[PDB]
Amino acid sequence: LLGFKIFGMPLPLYAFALITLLLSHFYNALPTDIVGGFAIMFIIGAIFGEIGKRLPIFNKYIGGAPVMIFLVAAYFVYAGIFTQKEIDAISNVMDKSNFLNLFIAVLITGAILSVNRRLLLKSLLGYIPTILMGIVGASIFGIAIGLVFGIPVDRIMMLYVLPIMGGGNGAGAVPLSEIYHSVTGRSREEYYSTAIAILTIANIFAIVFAAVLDIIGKKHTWLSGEGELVRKAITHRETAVGLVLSTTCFLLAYVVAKKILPSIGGVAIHYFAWMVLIVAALNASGLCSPEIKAGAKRLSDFFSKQLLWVLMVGVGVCYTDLQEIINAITFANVVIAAIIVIGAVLGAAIGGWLMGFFPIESAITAGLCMANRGGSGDLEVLSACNRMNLISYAQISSRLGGGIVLVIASIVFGMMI
Amino acid sequence: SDLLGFKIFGMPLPLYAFALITLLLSHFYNALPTDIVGGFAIMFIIGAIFGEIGKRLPIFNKYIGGAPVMIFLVAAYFVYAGIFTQKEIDAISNVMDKSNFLNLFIAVLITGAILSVNRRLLLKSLLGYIPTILMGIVGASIFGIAIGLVFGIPVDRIMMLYVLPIMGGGNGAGAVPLSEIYHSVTGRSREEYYSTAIAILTIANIFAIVFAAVLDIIGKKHTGQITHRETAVGLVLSTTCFLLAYVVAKKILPSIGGVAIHYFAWMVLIVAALNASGLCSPEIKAGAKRLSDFFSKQLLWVLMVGVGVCYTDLQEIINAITFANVVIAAIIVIGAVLGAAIGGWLMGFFPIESAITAGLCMANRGGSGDLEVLSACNRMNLISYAQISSRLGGGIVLVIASIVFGMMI
């Protein structure tokens, strides 16, 4: 028990914090600010984070730590566990103080500037277009099954395709909700609650088809290269600069979307979308030295691994409706989702074949590793089919491709609305 | 080419330009989110340029304060001169007060500064080094009050605007939090207090390094393991220890007597207790330190942009550069010297050495000063002691201040 850690805190220490939480709770004394917010969010997220991480079935196939937190957290608002004050504190961090944006800003920046200048520019020509091909196939098949299921083209694109292809929960579902609310007007929690649910279904199908394409690859060897895609031939300060660039790149994106270039056409370009383009540009410009480029990564790690659990406590409070989540686990979606994955498989297989890669390998990295739950999923997918050596490719899909999906989404959303 | 090798806030001039261009686009277009992201974006960039400028200036850097002073003055001049936009003022203030980054900042500092100190060193230090510090404070107060009564300034003002701020651990750690405690207990604006306190404190800092060389002449005449996670736990403990302090001050123990105990004061006691309890492993204890470094070294400059905007009046700063104050300040330092000399003699230390570490290294500008003081007298090997004064002693000063303030009011 003492050797057991919660969020890297021994049980004795965690108790100290958990006691404090309860003192604030009983006495109903809590500042509705950053400090008060994080204090709660950290502790609550910590316990339920570990709980969702330890659970076997749940951990590998549902999402684990983050899912457990954003569900539990929402149940606290539903069940009336939280105090008005505590809800205020948490919401004040997420929306008023706008930690959500910072979080996403840091992620975008670190994910894009991490990728090496050459790898990025090179990847564009072959691997990037394959990804786009996968998306086309994912959309075309999705729309096809939706039209068969009497669901309009809007919904299929916004609540199924885009969210599935997006890079997971924190990186796809969460920011797509924000873009959705900024462009339609409808609540975020309506969207996230459905999107997170479908996305998770697809994540389970992605790891299943990964093993199916492995069997097909080993049965029909002319399609699979044995694990090879192609057919032929720092200190605090750096990390701090990452933070500067994270915010600065968001501000530029913001000034562009609000004043300079509000709309390429009728279509309104959301500031997050712009950011991806800006950061990507900043990478190619090479204004950032490799040390700084890593600094940005080191930040995104710190956020993704330490502050993610905090974020989820807030996501369950503001972005999560437990009812819509339940309502989206319809047996019909399970089919729609699965088929969209298949659309991505065939889309990336065709695309990669056209770009010079092996169809099987392309469908795994530029296809399934897109439809999977961002990073966590890449590991789980590439293990089902033994292709763990392409992890570097898979992350290009989950990172750059996930960034693509936001830009695409900002356009899809607007023009559709 | 050489310029391009020139870095601003660890950003090459080309890169900084990218940011500085963005700042100006936000400025011209008047498009800026009044939130964390928008705030830090500005504060980072502005603080960066003026931070370096104040750091490079020779006279200014060593004796006035340097990077942070330059920023909190320039920043205030921007509000005064109307350089900043209402939006930009809002963004920055929203980060400092609404979002309350100030408290987090102080919370992180307190936690990392106290939990860094080794359990034994802390408990041991209490018996001998700590009481010496208290003796120095007594002497600093008694001499201060003496000169103030001579100058027709009441005992309140001497204790609140001169003694406490001087003995406190500098700008970010003493002056800035003492303003917060002052405003929480009197009701009067923070900027009124900070603007005077920062000014006197800086004067004393210059006297401290001078007397350090004077006492030198009189003396000669007569685990390393770390992870992001540990640092993150530092953040948890920083906030958690503030929350406990807060719940205690607001509900459990609002007042020991008529006197109201401010939550920051409680925090110091709580964190110190948490250290002695040893609930925190050395890895975690370092984690808290590693955070406070990241804050103190990276986010300090941001903080100062906000301190010039909310906590700084340029007029009161000018008005406190009183030649009368120059005398009052100097004497308070002398009071600390003799106070720590007597105290240390009683505790078994050398009077000269005690007056330097438990005396001048108190009255100096926190950590920054300790280096400048221990260089004037060649005692650089006591830096570890000096930091106990600047850290633990600075924490003491807040607890004392919360009591002094309340009972006086």
Ligand SMILES: CCCCCCCCO[C@@H]1O[C@H](CO)[C@@H](O)[C@H](O)[C@H]1O
């Ligand atoms: C027990 C293994 C199950 C495999 C199912 C497919 C059975 C064989 O499949 C057939 O094999 C031929 C090669 O000889 C191919 O030319 C055909 O395209 C293929 O469909």
Ligand SMILES: CCCCCCCCO[C@@H]1O[C@H](CO)[C@@H](O)[C@H](O)[C@H]1O
């Ligand atoms: C409000 C957000 C504050 C984020 C600050 C995170 C700074 C963490 O910074 C990290 O600290 C670690 C611990 O020493 C080091 O090992 C890493 O190299 C360093 O970059």
Ligand code: NA
């Ligand atoms: Na996906």
Ligand code: NA
């Ligand atoms: Na001082």
